[PDB]
Amino acid sequence: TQNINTVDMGLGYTSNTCVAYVNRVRTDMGVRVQDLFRVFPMNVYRHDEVDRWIRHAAGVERPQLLDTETISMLTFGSMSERNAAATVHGQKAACELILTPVTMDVNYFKIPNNPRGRASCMLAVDPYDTEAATKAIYDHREADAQTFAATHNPWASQAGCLSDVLYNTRHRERLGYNSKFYSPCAQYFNTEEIIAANKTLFKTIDEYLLRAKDCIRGDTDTQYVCVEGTEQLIENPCRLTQEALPILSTTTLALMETKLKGGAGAFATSETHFGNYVVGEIIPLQQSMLFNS
Amino acid sequence: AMEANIFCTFDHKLSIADVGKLTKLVAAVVPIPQRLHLIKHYQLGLHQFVDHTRGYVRLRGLLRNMTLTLMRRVEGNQILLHVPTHGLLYTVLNTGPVTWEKGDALCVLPPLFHGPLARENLLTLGQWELVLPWIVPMPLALEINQRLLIMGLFSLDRSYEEVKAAVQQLQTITFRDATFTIPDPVIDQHLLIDMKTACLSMSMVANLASELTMTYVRKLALEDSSMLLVKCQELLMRLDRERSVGEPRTPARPQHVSPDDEIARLSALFVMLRQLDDLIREQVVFTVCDVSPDNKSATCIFKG
Amino acid sequence: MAAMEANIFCTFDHKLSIADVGKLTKLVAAVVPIPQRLHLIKHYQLGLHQFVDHTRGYVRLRGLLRNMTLTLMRRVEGNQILLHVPTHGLLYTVLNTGPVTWEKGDALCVLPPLFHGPLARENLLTLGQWELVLPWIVPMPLALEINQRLLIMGLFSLDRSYEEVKAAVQQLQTITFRDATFTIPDPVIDQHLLIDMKTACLSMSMVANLASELTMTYVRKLALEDSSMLLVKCQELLMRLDPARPQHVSPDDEIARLSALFVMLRQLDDLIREQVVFTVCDVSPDNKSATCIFKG
Amino acid sequence: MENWSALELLPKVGIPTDFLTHVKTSAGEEMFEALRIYYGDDPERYNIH
Amino acid sequence: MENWSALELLPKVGIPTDFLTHVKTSAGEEMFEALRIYYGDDPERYNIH
Amino acid sequence: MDARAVAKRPRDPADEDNELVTALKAKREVNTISVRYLYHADHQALTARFFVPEGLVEFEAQPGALLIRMETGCDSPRHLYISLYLLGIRASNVSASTRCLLESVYTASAARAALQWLDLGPHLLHRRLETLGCVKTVSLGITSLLTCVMRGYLYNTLKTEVFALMIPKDMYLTWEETRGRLQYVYLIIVYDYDGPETRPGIYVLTSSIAHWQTLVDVARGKFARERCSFVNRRITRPRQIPLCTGVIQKLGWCLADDIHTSFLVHKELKLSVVRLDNFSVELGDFREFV
Amino acid sequence: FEAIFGTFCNRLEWVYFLTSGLAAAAHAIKFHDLNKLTTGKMLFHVQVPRVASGAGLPTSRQTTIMVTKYSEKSPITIPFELSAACLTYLRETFEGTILDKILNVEAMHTVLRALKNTADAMERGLIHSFLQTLLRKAPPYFVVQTLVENATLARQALNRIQRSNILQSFKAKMLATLFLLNRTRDRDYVLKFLTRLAEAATDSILDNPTTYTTSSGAKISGVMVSTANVMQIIMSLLSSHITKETVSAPATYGNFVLSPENAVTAISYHSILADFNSYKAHLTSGQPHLPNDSLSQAGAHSLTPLSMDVIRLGEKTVIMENLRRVYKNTDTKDPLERNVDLT
Amino acid sequence: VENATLARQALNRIQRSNILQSFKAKMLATLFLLNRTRDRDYVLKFLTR
């Protein structure tokens, strides 16, 4: 055994890190949605015949878990999802959020912004002011941060909305669920954490160097939450900003060809075609990551 | 030379390949019929206790008197063997059918070969072979002993299929990480004598106590210091359905039994219990602390 | 407080004759129960003699002996008595007092003394209105026969006339065992039995309800077909009279009834049991010494 | 709450102390654990018990 | 609760201490406002930190 | 064989050099490791590490407790370790004030799984429990790594302090009026069969008694009220077969004189507890009686 | 016949903590009685300089400021084992047959391997736990970059406009600096970036007059570590600045022997202050300042040369270091090899 | 060589898949050398690699 004792002799920070060189990407960068039936197994339809028709259409299995197994299922969780027989790419993820057909995409998707549809940076908020801190992120009498329209996404920004009851960890904790599955979107909805997350500026990044990182097991197909320690920790830059990054997307195959046929700057630009649109890409990784190899 | 050791020899010369099959059992339990020093391999092992007409009870009762002895180290033409001291930890070996879990109680039981083949044997050598007892966890071992007695209770009435359908299910134990078919004591129709010798011991108290006890309840009932005897006399009715004015309100009692014969009914009541007693209890020979990975070796503190 | 000392010195107040000290040298490694477990006990506490009573009940000596702490005598230099207390599970030499053959490998149990044919108890130690009564070490089967009869003695007396009570006590007091005869000193019906006699009869009753009808009919069916030397004797022990298939086959319920029955035989059978102590390995040819292991 | 009355009476060591964001901006953001700023002279230090 | 462990290690003075009523009697009378009597040898005195 | 060889006293390990030191002495090569004195070379006590969920670490953080394993029909965890204090919400013996006290401490979701599992089954509680030992040197974390004792005195490493064993006051009782110089600690579980459900009824019971016969005789005293119930249930419910009015098993023994009352302090809430001192561990299997 | 040509076995490498360039970031000390202590601390004192106010403006009184650092504690543990079978052939030799001696010579080397496999592991764990601590004190570059850019303006506790302006640089510096060699690769833009790191690093409070010093009087400062695949690029693009050098590394750990006066204070009230005897004379003299504060006084007078790499960034000769040498074949994940999620 | 260092354990199913991804991207880009680019620094880097 050994007993080292570190001492923070530095007044200001004496160490710093900058991300440098990608070599590979574990993520599938896929599309397949998270299966809530494996996230909330206990939920079932009231009518008997209806559930037989729903699971048959989604293709989801309908396990007959024993009453003993369900209790541990709601606590420690389990890797309920069967691993794929072959995976040429890697782990997949794609959490889903229903939103307005008349979303103001020109003011939203073109630039990085909160998936909730109302910006909720805690650094902009006055530290240790829980009353004001919870008002700007929920109460809509105040003008919104970023775009000053009160709420681009009424079905997401509201407290108690379908995105809130279904993805906030405390509202999810009241429901039965498998904790081991990892939903990327949950980090934006942790009201009991994010409201307490605000602090003085130097103390905020210090907590960012501890609790902010999340565990993800590395051998399983789909992502799973894991006990910290044995697995390498994964910091998320978005936790400091609470603003998700837009990516390239095309309404139709036609507009996609113009991007692939273009030069190095083609990914950066955004385009529209009547009711169709094409989101621009804020970080030109698509040209860089593949060509850089 | 601090460690005590029980030496053993071999009459047959070992094959060099055979020497390595003892090294796979460095920690296996090696029961010894009687404490000694030099021991011929014919004395070694449970195989000398094998019997033909005798049933499973003979293999188990002799095992209780055997001095369990952990294997130490094979050394050429020798077998080191140490008898564990009480209260010290030792690394035994999980040769038993069921995987161990931490903290489980353990009690030795004779091996039980079943129907379909699986693991068989490795140490055949001139008729004699090195059989080893199973080391089942205790809570499962109580279930095993209950099956062999009840399966012999149905041995008298194999003729009907519904009885055979039940014994077929009692034969199949179902527990954690394991399923097994414990062999039926019934064979060649008639039951083996050692089970029939034991099955009567249960039927004795099941019947002999159904009449002899009636006389002694009424006299002790006068005290009522614990009050239960007022209801204890009605516990002897042996019935489920409520009485319906058939008037068997009071138990039947023996009539004018001879005073000398009355003593014989009680004197023989307990000699049957002395035979049945061996199956009633299982000493905890070992208590595992933490199972080693691969479910092979496991450290255990010796008990008893 | 220091944990009770492994080594105990016993010192006698009364002056000892040479005839006494010579008996102690041959008494070495005998089991000598003590109650106090003090580092320096008086000889009055030594032995079982101080607990004797006018009733001289053999029953009360059985329960009082169970509260005793067994010890092995060692090194009888001079007046001092080195009563070492054995550790559990270790080997120790043992020296017999009661004349019993002691077959090797049997379990042993401490027992209140009986008497052999002389009745003199001769070569016993008398020491000024005091004696050294050391309880016998006996084989386990003898501990059953000496006690299972004793439970019967309180039962049979309950319904019989006093002239018929003495007739049974006269027979049950003697117990042959491994050639040698034995007899129980002053058996005594007492409240010491009644506290135990009642729970036995209660244990006799609960077993009568636990049994399945097939478990009780198993012999009456067996007499219809098979015949054997054991089965003929069992009919003498039972009332004579008072395939249709079993009435109900519920194996999950049948096996559950058996588990409660084992609770009774771990209890009712244990009433005649005494806790085992020494485990014989190799008896000496003189049968005056034997290595032993394990305690109560 | 430490023993702030001691620190201004105990002898210390003068050290260079360059660091980012002023000094009130750093201590005022609680980047250090314990702190005890005061804008005047402190009457409370001469007492001893 | 005091700091009895300091007294159990620090060197003292050989002062005679005659007084009435034995000495264990004083512990049973609470004549002193605080005490920590104990019988056997105490391992705990070595718990320096 | 030599006459001097039998003259020799039994070998003293402490006089001998350490096995790690001896190989270094043959090469005369210093290493950074301090091999001069191996730790835990002198402990008669036997121990084994137990990984534990973080939600059950409370109360156990104070040295001295009881870890009884609890088998479960779930495939994972297959064995949820249970503190005796966690079992107090289940025991009928605990006072409703004492029960409400510690129950607030068990707000962790991992602790919530325990109460769900004791109730769902038909099996009796004593069959699912298994005594293991006592806490010492808690690791504390998301997965606590307790070093539970198997057979011996609890104490701090290097013998610096002898840990006491803690027992709640409600579960402790004294049959004797005058303590003996020695008394064994028998853990005991006694059901009170009734009707809709069979409540437990824990009672740790120090006693001078050692022999099993006299030990279960005094147990028939105050517990005779359950004895009237266990028999009354038999005539009441044919086909139903209640078994074991109670269970006794040895846990260890104590010097008796060292015992005195105390109280634990955790999460602000206090809880008075009987405090065994030099409790040597001596495990004993459950023993049925009616 | 089935011939078997001679067997081979790898030779062990001899890593050391002081030999590594990561040690330049630490002032290592030995302290035998470490197990007893609970917490350490170092109180600070800062009185603010001020400038004269103009007419019509509020002035500024002198403002004393004091703060107290603490000290985190972590341990490490490596199991290793010897089979009792091989262990008993050690001291318990049998007859002196030539065959029996082989098991003695083998068991004696079984211990030498069992120790040096762990003794070598003990040095690497200090490399690993120390680098593990720096990651907890290593804010992402865009955070530190925002400070140096707007530190100067916010003399007061940050304004709500200032806090918003600080947040604006958190994003603008995140979308471009998120990856470097993957994107731009100008040889000057890398040097322009890396030289900006050393200006953003605050100096450690203690100073080292001589330890870690370039020959001919150049004063070393700073250090950095990376995976070999990234250092393989940096050796090329910045080869004009990189030079090998024999750094004067300390030869041995320092020590912090307790003062005899501390031995009383450790028992009297369970607390200690370093060099307690030194403070007494400074009160009687009335002098405020002291020559040193223990931690810089903790030995390490010895020094030894060893070769290292350095770079000329801002006239700060930063040490270069690579940890590929000390994590090869190890079953642990390399701490420098991590990953970054992007929503 | 690009991925050997990370995979101390036997390769993960995600690791094996990223191994396959390099097999396609490298096989096409390096399918022919002198037939494609003839840059001096590129071939000098490719050969020392």
CSV table of N, CA and C in Angstrom, one decimal, chain B residues 156 190 196 200, chain C residues 219 221-232 235:
chain,number,residue,atom,x,y,z
B,156,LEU,N,-43.5,-48.9,-2.5
B,156,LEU,CA,-44.5,-49.9,-2.3
B,156,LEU,C,-45.6,-49.9,-3.4
B,190,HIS,N,-38.5,-54.2,-6.4
B,190,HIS,CA,-38.4,-54.1,-5.0
B,190,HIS,C,-37.4,-53.1,-4.5
B,196,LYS,N,-35.6,-49.7,2.8
B,196,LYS,CA,-36.7,-50.3,3.5
B,196,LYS,C,-36.4,-50.4,5.0
B,200,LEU,N,-39.3,-48.0,7.3
B,200,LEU,CA,-40.1,-48.4,8.4
B,200,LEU,C,-39.9,-47.5,9.6
C,219,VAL,N,-46.5,-49.5,6.5
C,219,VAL,CA,-46.3,-50.9,7.0
C,219,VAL,C,-47.5,-51.8,6.9
C,221,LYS,N,-49.6,-51.8,4.5
C,221,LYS,CA,-49.5,-52.3,3.2
C,221,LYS,C,-48.4,-53.3,3.0
C,222,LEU,N,-47.2,-53.0,3.7
C,222,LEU,CA,-46.1,-53.9,3.5
C,222,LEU,C,-46.4,-55.3,4.1
C,223,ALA,N,-47.2,-55.4,5.2
C,223,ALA,CA,-47.5,-56.7,5.7
C,223,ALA,C,-48.4,-57.4,4.8
C,224,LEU,N,-49.2,-56.8,3.9
C,224,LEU,CA,-50.0,-57.4,3.0
C,224,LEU,C,-49.2,-58.2,1.9
C,225,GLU,N,-48.0,-57.8,1.7
C,225,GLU,CA,-47.2,-58.4,0.6
C,225,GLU,C,-45.9,-59.0,1.1
C,226,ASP,N,-44.9,-58.1,1.4
C,226,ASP,CA,-43.6,-58.6,1.9
C,226,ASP,C,-43.7,-59.2,3.3
C,227,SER,N,-42.8,-60.1,3.6
C,227,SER,CA,-42.6,-60.6,4.9
C,227,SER,C,-41.1,-60.6,5.2
C,228,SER,N,-40.8,-60.3,6.5
C,228,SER,CA,-39.4,-60.2,6.9
C,228,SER,C,-39.3,-60.4,8.4
C,229,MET,N,-38.1,-60.7,8.9
C,229,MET,CA,-37.9,-60.8,10.3
C,229,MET,C,-38.2,-59.6,11.1
C,230,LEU,N,-38.0,-58.4,10.5
C,230,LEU,CA,-38.3,-57.2,11.2
C,230,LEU,C,-39.8,-56.9,11.2
C,231,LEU,N,-40.5,-57.2,10.1
C,231,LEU,CA,-41.9,-56.9,9.9
C,231,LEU,C,-42.7,-57.7,10.9
C,232,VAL,N,-42.3,-58.9,11.2
C,232,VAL,CA,-43.1,-59.8,12.1
C,232,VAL,C,-43.1,-59.2,13.5
C,235,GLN,N,-45.5,-56.1,14.1
C,235,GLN,CA,-46.9,-56.4,14.3
C,235,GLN,C,-47.2,-56.6,15.8
